C-alpha cells in the first residue's frame, strides 16, 4: 500500500499493539506489588527469626 | 496565505483534482497533498471555448 | 477480438511467467484502472500464486 492506505492499516496495529503493550505492564505492576509485600514479609522474619 | 492555483482540464479528469488521487492528472500533471487544506472550484465552460 | 457477455464472463489464468503491470499502468488507454489491497505502481515488485 501506498501511505494514504497504509497508514490506515498501520494505525489499526498500532491501536492493538499498544493495548496489549499496557495490558502487560499494569499486569507487571500488580503482580511486583504482591512480590514486594511477600520480600518484606521474608526480611521481616530474617530479622525475627 | 491564500493561493489560487488555475488550469484547463476535460470532464473526465475533474475526479483527478483531489487528494489522495492517482492518474495521469493526478500523477504527472497537479497533485495534491492527503494533508490538503482548500477547496477545489471547477466549471464547465465549453460556451465560452 | 471478443469479449465475453457480463452474464458469462471469460477467466485466463496466468502462471510460470514474468508479470510487468508498467505497461497496462502507463499505457494512456484506459479510463478506469483502481487498485484494491495493491499498489498499481508497486506491482512489479510483487510475486503471486
Known sequence: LDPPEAEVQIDRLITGRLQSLQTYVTQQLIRAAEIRASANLAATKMSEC | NVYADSFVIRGDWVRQIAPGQTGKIADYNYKLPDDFTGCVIAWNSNNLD | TR??????????????CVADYSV????????????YGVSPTKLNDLCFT
Do not use: G, P, Q
Open chain 3, 24 to 35: 497496462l499502468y502507463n499505457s494512456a488507454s484506459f479510463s478506469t484502472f483502481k487498485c
Open chain 3, 3 to 16: 469479449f465475453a457477455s457480463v452474464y458469462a464472463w471469460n477467466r485466463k489464468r496466468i502462471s510460470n
